[PDB]
Each structure stands twice: as C-alpha cells, then as structure tokens.
Amino acid sequence: KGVKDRVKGKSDPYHATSGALSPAKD
Numbered sequence: 001k002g003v004k005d006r007v008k009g010k011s012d013p014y015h016a017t018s019g020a021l022s023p024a025k026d
Contacts, residue, residue, distance in 0.1 A: 007015050018024040
C-alpha cells in the first residue's frame with residue numbers, strides 16, 4: 001500500500017530510508 005501525509009514533515013524516516021534507497025520504496 002501507499003501513504004505519506006506523514007511525510008509532510010519531510011522528515012519521515014521510513015520513506016527516508018526508502019528514499020536514499022529509492023528502489024527500496026516499491
């Protein structure tokens with residue numbers, strides 16, 4: 001599933017992890 005809103009803080013670490021790891025997301 002997908003969801004942010006949480007990220008709004010752009011400090012979101014989970015996506016942050018998946019971000020530096022980009023392909024890590026999907």
